[PDB]
Design an enzyme around this catalytic site. Sequence first.
Site, PDB file in Angstrom:
ATOM      1  N   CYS A  92      19.133  83.389 -13.201  1.00 21.90           N
ATOM      2  CA  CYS A  92      19.042  84.944 -13.161  1.00 21.90           C
ATOM      3  C   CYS A  92      19.283  85.761 -12.008  1.00 21.90           C
ATOM      4  CB  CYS A  92      17.563  85.294 -13.935  1.00 21.90           C
ATOM      5  SG  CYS A  92      17.524  87.065 -14.258  1.00 21.90           S
TER       6      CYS A  92
ATOM      7  N   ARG B  80      16.474  88.894 -10.561  1.00 20.86           N
ATOM      8  CA  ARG B  80      15.039  88.495 -10.560  1.00 20.86           C
ATOM      9  C   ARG B  80      14.355  89.527  -9.325  1.00 20.86           C
ATOM     10  NH1 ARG B  80      15.030  82.303  -9.069  1.00 20.86           N
ATOM     11  NH2 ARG B  80      17.386  82.669  -8.905  1.00 20.86           N
TER      12      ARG B  80
END
Lengths: 403, 406
Positions: free
Chosen positions: A107, A110
């Site tokens: 990801c 974040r």
Amino acid sequence: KFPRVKNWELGSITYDTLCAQSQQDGPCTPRRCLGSLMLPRPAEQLLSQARDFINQYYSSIKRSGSQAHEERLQEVEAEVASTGTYHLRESELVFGAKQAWRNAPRCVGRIQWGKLQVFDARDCSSAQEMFTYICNHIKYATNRGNLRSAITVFPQRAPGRGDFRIWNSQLVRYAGYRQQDGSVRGDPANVEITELCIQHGWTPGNGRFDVLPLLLQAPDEAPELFVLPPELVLEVPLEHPTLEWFAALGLRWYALPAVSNMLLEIGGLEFSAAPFSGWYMSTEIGTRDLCDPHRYNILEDVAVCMDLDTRTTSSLWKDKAAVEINLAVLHSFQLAKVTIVDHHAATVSFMKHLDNEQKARGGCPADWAWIVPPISGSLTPVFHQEMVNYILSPAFRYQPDPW
Amino acid sequence: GPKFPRVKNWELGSITYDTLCAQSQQDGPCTPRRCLGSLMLPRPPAEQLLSQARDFINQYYSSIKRSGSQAHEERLQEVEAEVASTGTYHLRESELVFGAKQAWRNAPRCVGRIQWGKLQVFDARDCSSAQEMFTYICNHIKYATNRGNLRSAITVFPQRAPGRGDFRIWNSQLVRYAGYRQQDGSVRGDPANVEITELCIQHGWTPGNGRFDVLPLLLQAPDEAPELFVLPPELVLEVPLEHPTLEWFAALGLRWYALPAVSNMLLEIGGLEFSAAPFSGWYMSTEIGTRDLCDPHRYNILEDVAVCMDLDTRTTSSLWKDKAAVEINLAVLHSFQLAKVTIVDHHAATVSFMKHLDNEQKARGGCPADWAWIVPPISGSLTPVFHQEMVNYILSPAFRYQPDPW
Ligand code: HEM
Ligand code: HEM
Ligand SMILES: Cc1cc(N)nc(CCc2cncc(CCc3cc(C)nc(N)c3)c2)c1
Ligand SMILES: Cc1cc(N)nc(CCc2cncc(CCc3cc(C)nc(N)c3)c2)c1
Ligand SMILES: C[C@H](O)[C@H](O)[C@H]1CNc2nc(N)[nH]c(=O)c2N1
Ligand SMILES: C[C@H](O)[C@H](O)[C@H]1CNc2nc(N)[nH]c(=O)c2N1
Ligand SMILES: [Zn+2]
């Protein structure tokens, strides 16, 4: 033993010490790196994962070693000992959820990890009820274009019974209808899920953009079908800032990226139904969703609209169209006042995030092949940034499809 | 089922198992705890050498289909006898040719590997001076360049010896532009090359003052200080860069050289180490157009070009970086084509690598490949390789990095 981590644009160096807290093996061995694969294939153990997590929690609120901390450890031991499992407190759930995002190596978003609205749906006993929560989550997360990250957590898995499950891979998805021709109308990624919906009694449209219903599964029961009310599903028609003809392609995309097939693990407890959303990065829509050949595969269409030379790879027709398509996406989202982030902004904020986590924790697990965007990779700072990948808990994991 | 890594292409839905990895004799940097695959550089005894050599000889006899033969067991015998009395051994000419190609074949980070079988191997194991090194290299450049009809080639200098200094080429490529550090901290030319430039000046080079000055060669023969050699300009083919439609692009004064020739790598074969063994091919357009011209820490021309293109450089969401980059890349391709100098765009290069992957599946049961390096720095998911899982592992023969000689 501690990996030296270097940025090649600035000549700077850190050391990941965080990776020493990994308790879960990845796919690599000294012999061969498998880091580009998408999926590689007792009470004592739950108790010690539970201990670790409670320790993580009390430390996070600075009350480490206090009475509240001791008595909660005892509660957990008492509960596992008698029943083979235990339950989280709401705030502990809230902490674990944010941490699962924080620990997510694939990801790029974040930097936002601490801003997450958490809905406790653990008092859910039916597919019906699941649908009500799913609707609230969508209404909340969407917020009239002003997207807010959210998660909803349905009841944990339990040893003597089936899982609460959302069969859909995302909350919002376009149907993919296999045609007589072996062709596919709509999103090719959702052929199977479209077929399942139909097998369970959905009347199907016949567009390139039919929002699919949800199949919600309470324990040990057939899945149930639930249509989302069109009103809850914010969609953005795509146009281009300069090319008038683009709008005629009739392209569009939904605002809300909400993953719904991933499992959330907190202190050894598993939540098989825990949908989460935030907002899109444009390359996901403009590059992958629309330009993947096994997706909507619009690249050629666009390039012909742009009167480009398709005859040869060396005119870079593919690269020219891809940029325009990504541009269309950003423009259209900006015109419709719906949260989006381009891949330069996203990755700049990811670098800031690596710096915060270095100070805060001694490192950040990051998966380079996923963090680097799918166009213009070396044009972004993440490209030049060495990264260490490993598994921390709390975590989101992949899980097998329920059928 | 199969006890080997499963490898999937996500575009096509196809599956393979890499069984070749079982042949790997050297550990990389990853472990079950943490993947270190994105690291650029991760961190002789007789028995050791002998087993490496035996493996290479076996590899050689396999490739000519004479495994277990009398010539195979005699060559094995001849090799250990040699190590027995001297602690080293030497390759037969055709062994060197096989090993060199095998090193290229084995290189995880090279996307050009479909060409592996077509490599001119120049044997220069007789070379005994820095002057002669110069000669050999000029011959290499002349042959490899072939007036723009580029030809893959490698020149092999004498191997590392016990208690004797190495043959070394100090320059990391045979052709590089100078980087001149300025009074105002900035750099004129290529920032990548500051150190070597400064090393050349120290060693007596009269420097220029342009953005594209071809560096001289610093060549080192065993136990000698390095000697300096200027390449005669007629030998170094360059391409002035222009755009097919943006007419102003030619006025930027950009150019690049034709021949990508890596000169600082160690070529290891059967335990033997060739510290000087320059190899060259032809460019993929993204190397020049994206990395060399657009990296912030290289020529860094993205803003300049985007200004010329009249883009909005004040905000990320205009994708001004992406647009300029595409045109710079197109310009590279167009100008090379126009000058009739071999080049390959990242789309053809990657398609042909997919084909190489299928060839190697059939032939060796896998192909070591560094995903981060095989995927181009622009237009990543637009190329087929993006969707191809890859297994990375070290096979030998191999090319290795080696520490700078200074
Ligand atoms: C807030 C804005 C966010 C942005 C811009 C963002 C961006 C991204 C992107 C680009 C990816 C790669 C996706 C792909 O290629 O399929 C990704 C993956 C991921 N994101 Fe985020 N994300 C955001 C929020 C969140 C939130 C709220 C969570 C969970 C609470 C989350 C958890 C994950 C996980 C677990 C993955 C890996 C998915 C997988 O392995 O398939 N993200 N995100
Ligand atoms: C035939 C045309 C060739 C093309 C298009 C090609 C392409 C490339 C590219 C794009 C890279 C990445 C380099 C970078 O990002 O700076 C690379 C790396 C590499 N190439 Fe090839 N190459 C070719 C020929 C060769 C030849 C002839 C050899 C040796 C015989 C070779 C051996 C290598 C090695 C060892 C690397 C790794 C470099 C490193 O680790 O720094 N290539 N190649
Ligand atoms: C929270 C969030 C925000 C955002 N901007 N994007 C995402 C990406 C969502 C997303 C979309 N399409 C695909 C995936 C991964 C699909 C996927 C891939 C594999 C290999 N296995 C699975 N079980 C599932 C994730 C998530
Ligand atoms: C034969 C060949 C063909 C081709 N098309 N490109 C190349 C490019 C090779 C190349 C270009 N620029 C830079 C490098 C890296 C140089 C380099 C040197 C050291 C000591 N460590 C590193 N990690 C890297 C390699 C080589
Ligand atoms: C095989 C390869 O790792 C696979 O295609 C990955 C590569 N990187 C990715 N990166 C992101 N963000 N999303 C993806 O789906 C992928 N796919
Ligand atoms: C950090 C990262 O490993 C590094 O920047 C790598 C990524 N991939 C690359 N790929 C190629 N072909 N060349 C490079 O220099 C790099 N750099
Ligand atoms: Zn790895």
